[PDB]
Symmetry: D2
Subunit: 355 residues, 4 copies
């Protein structure tokens, strides 16, 4: 019932914007250990670590998602860290066993974000074939069923089109039950979430755009007798005045790296625009939307703490269970969010309950 919060780990060297603007944010482990500790102290339940094999959207350097996640877990106590994984260059036997060992070493705090892929050139560079849009989701669904089965069954057998297991016994299994997240917003993504995943993570959007996705998932999940929760990306710019927050947004966009934005935008046509419906990630993103590379400005958590808290509660009303927050200057703004924004959300929630 209370809304949950995650933050994007800036393990990619350009932060969370495609922009030349000065940021007090770094992609190295030293910066990120302290940020994970600040996020835990601020009240964030999850950190989300993105997966790249090569540079895109202005991230010339990227730390590998699973090892980096392990290091963040080792530096924290209660924080849960979601390691992103792309089927193809990743296989599920290795993923299940590596995640299970990290879970055993971190008191049960690792999770996974299965992402089905859009950056074709990256796959080509690393010798992976490029499956059709919905076919990438068929494979991701077999990957998810494989993870859950390996972790839950003494002797797991799975006779898939992409993956096979035959009486496979993983030991040790995870300490508890790792949560499986997935990223993407196409019909194929919503279908998979309503079947196998614990969480559907989606790009930023208007309230109406989010409600449309939630309503489809809820109906499908109910018919499948499956439980799934909803998280939405938001690039949060909280400042003491609304004018200052809008001025920061304008600086970010004014300083956009246009060659990086356009190259990202071209590659992103292999996500939602390439699905049979032509709907999903980046299908309707302008140059200015792309400057936050998961459409995070659209969620409009930009203004005063009070405006942002009221907007978060309005997202709860259409079925959002978690806000996935990106920031410009991560350490100071995560701390500010915990001191100034999150307590206002909790007060609004207490007042709603007592009525």
């Amino acid at each position: 019932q209370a809304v949950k919060f995650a933050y994007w780990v800036p393990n990619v060297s350009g932060g969370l914007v495609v922009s030349r603007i000065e940021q007090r944010t770094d992609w190295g482990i030293d910066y990120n250990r302290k940020l994970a500790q600040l996020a835990e102290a601020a009240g964030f339940e999850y950190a989300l670590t993105q997966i790249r094999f090569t540079a895109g959207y202005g991230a010339e350097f990227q730390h590998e998602s699973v090892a980096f996640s392990h290091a963040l877990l080792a530096a924290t106590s209660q924080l849960k860290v979601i390691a992103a994984i792309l089927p193809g260059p990743w296989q599920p036997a290795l993923a299940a066993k590596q995640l299970a060992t990290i879970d055993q070493l971190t008191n049960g705090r690792i999770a996974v974000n299965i992402v089905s892929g859009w950056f074709r050139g990256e796959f080509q560079a690393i010798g992976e074939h490029w499956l059709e849009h919905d076919e990438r989701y068929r494979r991701s669904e077999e990957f998810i069923r494989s993870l859950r089965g390996i972790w839950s069954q003494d002797n797991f057998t799975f006779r898939g089109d992409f993956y096979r297991f035959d009486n496979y016994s993983l030991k040790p299994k995870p300490l508890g039950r790792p949560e499986i997240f997935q990223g993407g917003s196409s019909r194929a993504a919503r279908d998979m979430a309503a079947r196998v995943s614990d969480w559907y993570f989606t790009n930023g959007n208007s309230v109406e755009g989010i409600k449309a996705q939630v309503d489809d998932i809820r109906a499908k999940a109910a018919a499948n007798h499956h439980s799934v929760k909803i998280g939405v990306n938001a690039f949060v710019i909280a400042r003491d005045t609304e004018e200052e927050a809008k001025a920061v947004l304008a600086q970010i966009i004014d300083q956009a790296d246009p060659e990086a934005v356009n190259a990202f935008g071209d590659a992103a046509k292999q996500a939602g625009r390439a699905s049979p419906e032509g709907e999903g990630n980046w299908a309707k993103s302008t140059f200015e939307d792309l400057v936050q590379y998961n459409d995070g400005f659209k969620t409009n958590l930009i203004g005063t703490p009070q405006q942002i808290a009221e907007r978060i509660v309005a997202l709860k009303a259409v079925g959002v269970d978690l806000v996935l927050a990106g920031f410009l200057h991560f350490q100071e703004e995560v701390e500010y969010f915990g001191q100034r924004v999150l307590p206002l959300v909790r007060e609004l929630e207490a007042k709603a309950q007592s009525a």
Copy 2:
């Protein structure tokens, strides 16, 4: 020129013997962090972490090799940790990037042991096809060429029979040059080491058995203009008296687990016995040899510290550059080795220098 020492990480729940004998050894992270610190204090330069996906040779539980290596590096300062990797369920793009990130996080202290595989049933359980003996080495050599090329250049291209890369740029690369080890003793293994590897690791053997491998590698490496060093497995039983060490050895063997040894021995026929020459790992192993699952008793580092030190220097004279030590009670025997055996080795080397 000084001989180097590695120890086997007991990340598999049966320790380093296929036996019911009581051992003060454990496979969990708590035991292994302390063990790694003691090993570093004792003068071991490397720890070697074995790779399993499911139980064999008496190891019902096994921690995943790379994440466990990451954790041991996080708990130490100068120790180098070698993570074992099996091509097939591992792919080189992910290995290259995950190892590069761990390298960056650990001040350049991770290495890799490419092992080409023998446990067919394990591959079948996780959906991997079983290549012919020498073909597994063909694949491993492509895997090693990919790791080395990815780590050393931008725009790496490789048009292999097993792996493809196309203008691939990994960032960040490792801090320096990670060492590539490999395990196996067949002709295919020796040929691969003489072409692409930094270290050839081999099973325990007599001095003459080791000499025959080194001489073959030396000639082949010279013809390729390639440098490779030699490490040999030895199960070290050092006691204050020779009689006590021999009694321990007999206790380990007398308490051998026959189901596990039979099952291991049958599976191990897919290593040296299955090569075109019929030579390599386990091709000549009796039931008693198999109780140490890399033929470690054959190296005969079993006796007083003085006998062991002399035997180590004798191995050096046939071209052994590193002794890879297994133990029964890891923490206490690593400490004893550093206090009682290693200094005798260093004295012998110093006396040989002045002569």
Copy 3:
């Protein structure tokens, strides 16, 4: 420089339309042997088989394209027969060797039509992964380069992303140089034709639509220093009067099987509509277009013999080198074409030549 003619082999039940109308057409070898002999006598240079692995509704039975082509060549003397091949369920080593042997047995009269695929459900049923639209063309281009190299040289080596060859020597090679045709009309198809194919076969279309494809191919092929010819599908309804030919067309469409048409149109969305440009086979086909399953009515070769001859010559004037003809009643209409239509084309061509 004379325009060439092919006919579609009705090796799929239901003929060349998705309609319940009575057809004096059959898919068996007896009807098709006689039809091939009639087509050779009528002046057709080629027969084009189609490739299916499964189908529903009236298209319920399909003879395998290569072995059926071999049988048709065995029943004829001069006719060339083009065997359709889909990369994926077909591999290029077997295709090259099987076609070379058939070429040797048939006096050099076999050709191949490389088709890159649109029917996703058929691939899934036979265990094949569904690659993205342009990726299927990347694979088809490697397939074609493989056929051409294997057939033309010993020691053929190819280091593809999809296919590898290592000093492969096929013996015997074909008697002559088999022509490579390809089917498809997207940008990816045109790019491939301008690089590697002898013939670009495309769906039916207006003169304007054909000319736009020819102009793009001609520019690209010139820059590649590559020669490629153009063939266009047309469903030919030649009758003594224009009114009767139009009545037959209305009858075909009026008796269309609506469920079959809709199921075909839904699956065909994986062709042109799924390409990045949204253009290619079936991207703009209405219900009535889909009744001829390669848009054959659009080419408007429906009317008197004189009208049809003038329209064929008009297609030649925009770069069409070959008309690929479908018919309702194959045997009798092939005979009528050779007696009533083809001679008018030749007369028109002769009269143009006298100027």
Copy 4:
């Protein structure tokens, strides 16, 4: 039951021996059409067409097995023709459909010989990975189960480690039930034959060597409740005097091409010698044995017609159901076998029946 007879189709340019001796045998279709007709008239029930993709054992040129088998069936009326297929470069969906169409065109007379592979260099040349010996039989068994299922059921589903099918309906199916033969003599081969195949074809051998294989197959097949028949290769040299037949054998061997024989012997080490038991095809073949490349001289059908007929009947007594005959001068020796040897076998069988 009356013993059945097959002959090897000389679809390979060196005939059935690795020798420079002058042979009145040709690999082209004209010689082979007349040969198949003579064999049919002589009383051979089957022809067997070997599969190569590149030159081995002196076969500089090789016609493709399936298309050549189709052409031989087209030249005959009752002869059954067995096309050899190697899983790997062949896939089962295509094999099933192509064979079914040929079966429909030839009145149900096509069969298949599934061979699991020994010629590693050929696979490497055509881009195929080299599976371990027993794993090749694992794949071949899935291939056989797929053929059998596709041919016999609509909506065939098969969830293999090598092949997948999902509700696949092949139409048309064969006219009846095609026979599945397999070649190979290792434990893996015998185990496969005892589970899925109609015929086990084996290399030439002594009576005792054959009986040891039959006895193992019989016990295994009885435990599986499976029916399988036995065929044995024999290189038949029938002459009016024993002295003449022996002189011919000596001439073949004396004119052996020793570079070809040794190169074949080396490649053949990947058959029986590479199996876990070290037993199977070519494991015990001397230089002289290898001159007939399936050990055909060992069966000793070399002598007068009377001697050969008695030795055939003696093979029946250890469970041989079919003799698979090679010859030096094919057309003339097939005609002679039918005039002079086969009638003696029939008289001996008639005399045994009346006792």
